[PDB]
Amino acid sequence: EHIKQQALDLFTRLQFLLQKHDTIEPYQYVLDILETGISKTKHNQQTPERQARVVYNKIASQALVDKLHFTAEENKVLAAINELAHS
């Protein structure tokens, strides 16, 4: 299904957006999470929906840990990843 590409596109879109801040250090962990989600999905591990769930949960958690403040656009993509991870 095209669900795989859908997931990859959401992950890369978010990676792009997260690099638009004044610094990148506070976002590196989240970028690592996305790179890993992309690798796992590219290598067909579990399902794209499962990888999206993990990416979303890990980013939501890190946002607490690194006190991250996402933009409307970033939150929109994150919500889309959460949605995909539910259906």
Author numbering: 7 to 93
Publication excerpt:
In general, type IIa bacteriocins are coexpressed with cognate immunity proteins (pediocin-like immunity proteins) composed of 88~115 amino acids, in order to protect the organism from the antimicrobial activity of its own bacteriocin. Based on the remarkable degree of sequence identity (~99%) of PedB of P. pentosaceus to that of P. acidilactici, we regarded PedB as the immunity protein against pediocin PP-1. PedB is a small positively charged protein with 112 amino acids and belongs to subgroup A. No transmembrane helices are predicted from sequence analysis. The 1.6 Å crystal structure of PedB reveals that PedB consists of an antiparallel four-helix bundle with a flexible C-terminal end.
The initial model was built according to the phased electron density map obtained by using anomalous scattering differences of selenium atoms in the selenomethionyl L24M crystal. A final model for native PedB was refined subsequently to 1.6 Å resolution against native data. The native PedB crystals contain one molecule in the asymmetric unit. Out of the total 112 amino acids in native PedB, residues 7–93 are visible in the crystal structure. The crystal structure reveals that PedB forms a compact globular domain composed of four helices. They are arranged so that α1 and α3 run in the same direction and α2 and α4 in the opposite direction, forming an antiparallel four-helix bundle. The relative disposition of the four helices of PedB is maintained mainly by a network of hydrophobic interactions in the core of the molecule: Phe17, Leu20, and Leu24 from α1 (residues 9–26), Leu48 from α2 (residues 31–49), Val61 and Ile65 from α3 (residues 55–72), Leu74 and Phe76 from the loop between α3 and α4, Leu84 and Ile87 from α4 (residues 80–92) form a hydrophobic core. The C-terminal end of PedB (residues 94–112) that is thought to be important for immunity has no electron density, suggesting that this region is flexible. As expected, the structure of PedB is well-superimposed to that of EntA-im with r.m.s.d. of 1.3 Å for all Cα atoms. Deletion of last four residues (PedB1–108) resulted in severe loss of immunity compared to the wild type PedB, and deletion of seven residues (PedB1–105) almost completely abolished the activity.
